[PDB]
Amino acid sequence: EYDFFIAHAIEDKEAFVQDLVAALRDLGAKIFYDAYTLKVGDSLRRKIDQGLANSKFGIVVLSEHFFSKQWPARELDGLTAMETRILPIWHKVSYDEVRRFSPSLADKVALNTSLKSVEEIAKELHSLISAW
Amino acid sequence: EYDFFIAHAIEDKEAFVQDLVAALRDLGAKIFYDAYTLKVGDSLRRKIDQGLANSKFGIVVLSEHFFSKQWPARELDGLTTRILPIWHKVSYDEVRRFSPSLADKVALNTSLKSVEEIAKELHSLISAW
C-alpha cells in the first residue's frame, strides 16, 4: 500500500506534478503517478476510487487544465466528501475560477502553490504519512 | 483624479482585468486600464509613475503573462504604499524564479479572495487616502 496517488491533468504532468513527485519521493514517500493522468473521457470518480484502493491518500492537482476537462459537477463536489483521504492542491487557479466549477471545492481549505513552495508542500504532505 | 489604474499584460485584459474593473466600478471607484496594457519595450517604472500622476493608486496584475514579458530584474525587485500587485494564477516557485523579493512580499492573491472581495478591499483604500 502506497502513501499517495496524484491525479492530474496531462498538461500539468511534466511541470508541477513531476516536481511534487520528485520532492515527495526524496522524503521517502511512496507515490503513484503515471497511471493517474486524467484525460478527456475518463471517469474521475473511478480513477479516485482506484487510487484510494491502493493508497492512503489522494492528491488532486486542481488547475485550469484539470477543470477544463469538464468533469461532472457531482464528481467534483464528491472530492470534498468525508469517509478525508482526498487532498486537493490549488495550482494557478483563482477562487472564482474554482467556484465556477464547484462552490464546495472552492470553500474546502486546501494546499495552494502560490502560498508555499513545492518543497514546503512535500513536507506537509509527508507529515500525513510519517511517524514523525 | 482617479482611484486606480490597472497595469496588465494583454492576455489578462479581457479576462481578470475586465472582472476587476467591472467589480470596482460597481462600488463607485474610478478606474482606467485601456492605456496601461504592458508590452516588452516598456519601462515598468515609467508606466507606473505615468499612471500614479493621474491616479491615487496603481494595480499590477502579477500573472504568468505579466512575467512572460521578460521584465528587468531590478524593476521587479523594486516593484513596490501606492503600488498594489495582485497575484493571479501563479505559483510561489514561479514568481520566485523572476524575483525572490517579489515572491516573499505580501500582496493580494486571487486564489484567496473572489474578485468582489478584492474589489471591496481595494475600495476601502480610497476612503483611507
Coordinates of C-alpha atoms in Angstrom, one line a residue:
Chain A
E1 CA 0.0 0.0 0.0
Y2 CA 1.3 3.4 -1.1
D3 CA 1.2 6.7 0.7
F4 CA -0.2 8.8 -2.2
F5 CA -1.6 8.7 -5.7
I6 CA -1.6 12.0 -7.6
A7 CA -4.4 12.7 -10.1
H8 CA -3.7 15.5 -12.5
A9 CA -4.4 16.8 -16.0
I10 CA -1.7 15.7 -18.5
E11 CA -0.9 19.3 -19.2
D12 CA 0.4 19.5 -15.6
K13 CA 2.2 16.2 -15.8
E14 CA 5.7 17.2 -16.6
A15 CA 5.6 20.5 -14.7
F16 CA 4.3 20.9 -11.2
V17 CA 3.3 17.2 -10.8
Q18 CA 6.8 15.9 -11.6
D19 CA 8.3 18.5 -9.2
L20 CA 6.0 17.3 -6.4
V21 CA 6.5 13.6 -7.2
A22 CA 10.3 14.1 -7.0
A23 CA 10.2 16.0 -3.8
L24 CA 7.9 13.6 -2.1
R25 CA 9.9 10.6 -3.2
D26 CA 13.0 12.3 -2.0
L27 CA 11.5 12.4 1.5
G28 CA 10.8 8.7 1.1
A29 CA 7.1 8.7 0.4
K30 CA 5.7 6.1 -2.0
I31 CA 3.6 7.8 -4.8
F32 CA 1.6 6.5 -7.7
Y33 CA 1.8 9.0 -10.6
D34 CA 1.9 7.6 -14.2
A35 CA -1.4 5.8 -14.2
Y36 CA -3.3 8.7 -12.7
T37 CA -3.1 11.1 -15.6
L38 CA -6.6 12.3 -16.3
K39 CA -7.7 12.8 -19.9
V40 CA -11.0 13.9 -21.5
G41 CA -13.3 10.9 -21.3
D42 CA -12.0 9.3 -18.1
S43 CA -14.1 8.8 -15.0
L44 CA -12.8 11.0 -12.2
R45 CA -14.8 9.0 -9.6
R46 CA -13.5 5.7 -10.8
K47 CA -9.9 7.0 -11.0
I48 CA -10.2 8.3 -7.5
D49 CA -11.7 5.0 -6.3
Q50 CA -8.9 3.1 -7.9
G51 CA -6.2 5.2 -6.4
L52 CA -7.7 5.1 -2.9
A53 CA -7.9 1.3 -3.1
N54 CA -4.1 1.2 -3.4
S55 CA -3.0 4.3 -1.4
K56 CA -3.5 6.0 2.0
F57 CA -4.2 9.4 0.4
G58 CA -5.3 11.1 -2.8
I59 CA -3.8 14.2 -4.2
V60 CA -5.7 16.0 -6.9
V61 CA -3.9 18.9 -8.7
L62 CA -6.7 21.5 -9.1
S63 CA -5.6 23.6 -12.1
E64 CA -7.0 25.2 -15.1
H65 CA -6.2 22.1 -17.2
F66 CA -7.9 20.0 -14.6
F67 CA -11.2 21.8 -14.7
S68 CA -11.0 22.3 -18.5
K69 CA -11.7 18.5 -18.8
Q70 CA -15.2 19.4 -17.9
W71 CA -15.8 16.8 -15.1
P72 CA -19.3 16.1 -13.9
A73 CA -20.4 18.6 -11.2
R74 CA -21.2 15.9 -8.6
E75 CA -17.9 14.2 -9.0
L76 CA -16.1 17.5 -8.3
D77 CA -18.4 18.1 -5.3
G78 CA -17.6 14.4 -4.4
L79 CA -13.9 15.1 -3.9
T80 CA -15.0 17.0 -0.8
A81 CA -16.8 14.1 0.9
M82 CA -15.6 12.6 4.2
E83 CA -15.4 8.9 5.0
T84 CA -10.9 12.9 4.1
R85 CA -8.5 10.9 2.1
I86 CA -8.6 13.4 -0.8
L87 CA -6.2 16.4 -0.6
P88 CA -6.7 19.0 -3.3
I89 CA -3.9 21.3 -4.3
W90 CA -4.8 24.5 -5.9
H91 CA -2.4 25.3 -8.8
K92 CA -2.5 28.5 -10.8
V93 CA -6.3 28.9 -10.3
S94 CA -8.3 31.7 -8.8
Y95 CA -11.0 31.3 -6.2
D96 CA -13.7 32.5 -8.7
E97 CA -12.4 30.0 -11.3
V98 CA -12.8 27.1 -8.9
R99 CA -16.2 28.3 -7.6
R100 CA -17.4 28.4 -11.2
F101 CA -16.9 24.6 -11.3
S102 CA -17.6 23.7 -7.7
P103 CA -18.6 26.0 -4.8
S104 CA -17.9 23.2 -2.3
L105 CA -14.4 22.7 -3.6
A106 CA -13.8 26.4 -3.6
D107 CA -14.6 26.7 0.1
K108 CA -12.8 23.5 1.1
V109 CA -9.5 24.5 2.6
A110 CA -6.6 23.0 0.7
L111 CA -2.9 23.4 -0.2
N112 CA -2.1 26.2 -2.6
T113 CA 1.1 26.5 -4.7
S114 CA 1.0 30.3 -4.5
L115 CA 1.4 30.2 -0.7
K116 CA 4.1 27.5 -0.5
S117 CA 7.0 26.1 -2.5
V118 CA 6.9 22.6 -3.9
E119 CA 9.3 21.6 -1.1
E120 CA 7.2 23.1 1.6
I121 CA 4.1 21.2 0.2
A122 CA 6.1 18.0 0.0
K123 CA 7.0 18.3 3.8
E124 CA 3.4 18.9 4.8
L125 CA 2.0 16.0 2.8
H126 CA 4.8 13.9 4.1
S127 CA 3.7 14.6 7.6
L128 CA 0.4 12.8 7.0
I129 CA 2.1 9.5 6.3
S130 CA 5.1 9.6 8.6
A131 CA 5.5 8.6 12.3
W132 CA 7.4 12.0 12.8
Chain B
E1 CA -8.3 62.4 -10.0
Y2 CA -8.6 58.7 -10.4
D3 CA -8.7 55.9 -7.8
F4 CA -6.9 53.1 -9.7
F5 CA -5.2 52.3 -12.9
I6 CA -4.6 48.6 -13.8
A7 CA -1.3 47.6 -15.3
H8 CA -1.6 44.2 -17.0
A9 CA -0.4 42.0 -19.9
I10 CA -2.7 42.0 -22.9
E11 CA -3.5 38.3 -22.2
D12 CA -5.3 39.3 -19.0
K13 CA -7.1 42.3 -20.4
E14 CA -10.5 40.8 -21.4
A15 CA -10.3 38.3 -18.5
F16 CA -9.3 39.1 -15.0
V17 CA -8.8 42.8 -15.8
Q18 CA -12.3 43.1 -17.1
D19 CA -13.7 41.4 -14.0
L20 CA -11.8 43.5 -11.5
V21 CA -12.7 46.8 -13.3
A22 CA -16.4 45.9 -13.5
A23 CA -16.4 45.0 -9.8
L24 CA -14.6 48.2 -8.8
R25 CA -16.8 50.5 -10.9
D26 CA -19.9 48.8 -9.3
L27 CA -18.6 50.1 -5.9
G28 CA -18.3 53.6 -7.4
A29 CA -14.5 53.7 -7.9
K30 CA -12.8 55.5 -10.8
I31 CA -10.6 53.3 -12.9
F32 CA -8.8 53.3 -16.3
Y33 CA -6.8 50.5 -17.7
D34 CA -7.0 50.7 -21.5
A35 CA -3.8 52.7 -21.9
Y36 CA -2.0 50.5 -19.4
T37 CA -1.5 47.2 -21.3
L38 CA 2.2 46.4 -20.9
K39 CA 4.4 45.2 -23.7
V40 CA 8.2 44.4 -23.7
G41 CA 9.8 47.7 -24.6
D42 CA 8.0 49.5 -21.8
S43 CA 9.8 50.7 -18.7
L44 CA 7.7 49.3 -15.8
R45 CA 8.7 52.1 -13.5
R46 CA 7.9 54.7 -16.2
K47 CA 4.5 53.3 -17.0
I48 CA 3.7 53.1 -13.3
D49 CA 4.8 56.7 -12.5
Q50 CA 2.9 57.9 -15.6
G51 CA -0.3 56.3 -14.0
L52 CA 0.5 57.5 -10.5
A53 CA 0.4 61.1 -11.7
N54 CA -3.2 60.7 -12.7
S55 CA -4.5 58.2 -10.2
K56 CA -4.3 57.7 -6.4
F57 CA -3.3 54.0 -6.6
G58 CA -2.0 51.6 -9.2
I59 CA -2.7 47.9 -9.6
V60 CA -0.3 45.4 -11.3
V61 CA -1.7 42.1 -12.3
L62 CA 1.1 39.6 -11.5
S63 CA 0.1 36.7 -13.7
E64 CA 2.2 34.3 -15.8
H65 CA 1.6 36.5 -18.8
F66 CA 3.0 39.5 -16.9
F67 CA 6.1 37.6 -16.1
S68 CA 6.4 36.3 -19.7
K69 CA 7.2 39.9 -20.9
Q70 CA 10.8 39.5 -19.5
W71 CA 10.9 42.5 -17.2
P72 CA 14.4 43.5 -16.0
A73 CA 15.1 42.0 -12.6
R74 CA 15.7 45.5 -10.9
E75 CA 12.3 46.7 -11.9
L76 CA 10.7 43.5 -10.5
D77 CA 12.7 43.7 -7.2
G78 CA 11.7 47.3 -6.7
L79 CA 8.2 46.9 -7.9
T80 CA 6.7 48.2 -4.6
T81 CA 2.1 52.4 -0.3
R82 CA 0.8 53.3 -3.8
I83 CA 1.5 50.3 -6.0
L84 CA -0.6 47.2 -5.3
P85 CA 0.3 43.9 -7.1
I86 CA -2.2 41.2 -7.3
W87 CA -1.0 37.6 -7.8
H88 CA -3.2 35.9 -10.4
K89 CA -2.8 32.2 -11.3
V90 CA 0.8 31.9 -10.4
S91 CA 2.8 29.7 -8.0
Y92 CA 5.3 30.9 -5.4
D93 CA 8.1 28.9 -7.1
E94 CA 7.1 30.5 -10.4
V95 CA 7.3 34.1 -9.1
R96 CA 10.4 33.4 -7.2
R97 CA 12.2 32.5 -10.4
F98 CA 11.8 36.1 -11.6
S99 CA 12.2 37.9 -8.3
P100 CA 12.7 36.3 -4.9
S101 CA 11.8 39.6 -3.3
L102 CA 8.5 40.0 -5.2
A103 CA 7.6 36.4 -4.2
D104 CA 8.1 37.0 -0.5
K105 CA 6.2 40.3 -0.5
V106 CA 2.7 40.1 1.0
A107 CA 0.2 41.0 -1.7
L108 CA -3.3 40.4 -2.9
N109 CA -3.9 37.0 -4.3
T110 CA -6.9 35.9 -6.4
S111 CA -6.7 32.3 -5.2
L112 CA -7.6 33.6 -1.7
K113 CA -10.4 36.0 -2.5
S114 CA -13.1 36.4 -5.1
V115 CA -12.9 39.4 -7.4
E116 CA -15.7 41.0 -5.4
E117 CA -13.8 40.7 -2.1
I118 CA -10.7 42.0 -3.7
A119 CA -12.7 45.0 -5.1
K120 CA -14.2 45.7 -1.6
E121 CA -10.7 45.7 -0.1
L122 CA -9.2 48.0 -2.7
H123 CA -12.3 50.2 -2.5
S124 CA -11.8 50.7 1.3
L125 CA -8.3 52.2 0.5
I126 CA -9.8 55.2 -1.3
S127 CA -11.6 56.2 1.9
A128 CA -8.3 56.0 3.8
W129 CA -6.3 58.2 1.4

